């Protein structure tokens, strides 16, 4: 019954910045994870709340595919109960996550010479991020007790910082494309399971 549009997500020309992670709904298809492989050298495929071996014998009300890019030393922060800049400011996953993440290196395809400024991450925020929340406001974040009326300068920085991806970066500093599939199931007809 049709194949899930995993190409449109994994083969996508450009991934959104982590602070504006995309969200594509996938339903009314069959998840054939066999074809997912042989697409770059994956760096992580770890699933919580569901045994991968039986992934083909169960399906859900729907699944949400959130795609973004982060540096390797940061990918470990994409997991329930984790802490870090990404975990508290950009992308936060609930402790009861029912789904799992996929990460693969994209250095050869997503690291321009001299710095790729197309990708930004939120480095400052007043408070942590609630699970599955999106923030895109670029208001000037004051740090001290001196209001700056929205002017960049001393003790008042621009919240977003661009990732300086370069070919000569560290082994783990190179960009990593991350796609998180959140399997959401309720008392509704199932939508996305592969061959029995």
């Amino acid at each position: 019954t049709n194949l899930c549009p995993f190409g449109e997500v994994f083969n996508a020309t450009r991934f959104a910045s982590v602070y504006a992670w995309n969200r594509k709904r996938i339903s009314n298809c069959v998840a054939d994870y066999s074809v997912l492989y042989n697409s770059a050298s994956f760096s992580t495929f770890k699933c919580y709340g569901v045994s991968p071996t039986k992934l083909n014998d169960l399906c859900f009300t729907n699944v949400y595919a959130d795609s973004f890019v982060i540096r390797g030393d940061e990918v470990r922060q994409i997991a329930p109960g984790q802490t870090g800049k990404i975990a508290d400011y950009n992308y936060k996953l609930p402790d009861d996550f029912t789904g799992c993440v996929i990460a693969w290196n994209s250095n050869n395809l997503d690291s321009k010479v001299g710095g790729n400024y197309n990708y930004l991450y939120r480095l400052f925020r007043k408070s942590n991020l609630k699970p599955f929340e999106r923030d895109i406001s670029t208001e000037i974040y004051q740090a001290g007790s001196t209001p700056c009326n929205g002017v960049e300068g001393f003790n008042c920085y621009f919240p977003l910082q661009s990732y300086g991806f370069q070919p000569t970066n560290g082994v783990g500093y190179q960009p990593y494309r991350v796609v998180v599939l959140s399997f959401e199931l309720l008392h509704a007809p199932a939508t996305v399971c592969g061959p029995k």
Partner: antibody
Amino acid sequence: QVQLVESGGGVVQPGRSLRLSCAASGFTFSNYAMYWVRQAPGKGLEWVAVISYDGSNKYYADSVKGRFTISRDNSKNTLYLQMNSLRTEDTAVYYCASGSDYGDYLLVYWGQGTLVTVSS
Amino acid sequence: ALTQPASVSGSPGQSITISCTGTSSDVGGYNYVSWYQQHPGKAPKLMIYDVSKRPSGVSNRFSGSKSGNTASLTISGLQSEDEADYYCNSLTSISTWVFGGGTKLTVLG
């Protein structure tokens, strides 16, 4: 296919200006970093210059530091190399490489490239 | 720069190896080498993408490999039409794209 055409330049006197233009088509020029690579007649290749995908950062080989200037304009999809204070040793054929998808640190397309002769 | 053999010769059919070496910064620490084949009077075109890979459309015979500080190309069943110059590239620190030098392949015709 992807085309890259160099304006070229005839024999010029040593220590005189010269503008070379590489015009590209068939791919997203404004999304990749071009390179200029020289080859002396009968010798091996030698990287000359590179410019970032938006012109913010430019890098030059030590041999041409402080004399060349690489720029680009995405409005008309062209790349320019300005040469000042030429030297006799500098005669060579210039290739305008692209660094296409699945690699930006490496040179891929290598348009036909023109010839520049520096003799008095 | 990098060091390469001045010339390599070989009859058609067998395996031919071409090796280039540099300091740790050029290739010993960075696995970004990529080799180009330039025919006489022609624009060089990529042959081995990355340390060991090949762009779509190139011959399957060519195969790149890396041994510690050295990088080598292996050609299986090379034909007469494979007679051309071969350069090994490498991305070093602070940019500075070094180049292999020169290596000519000939067939005992």
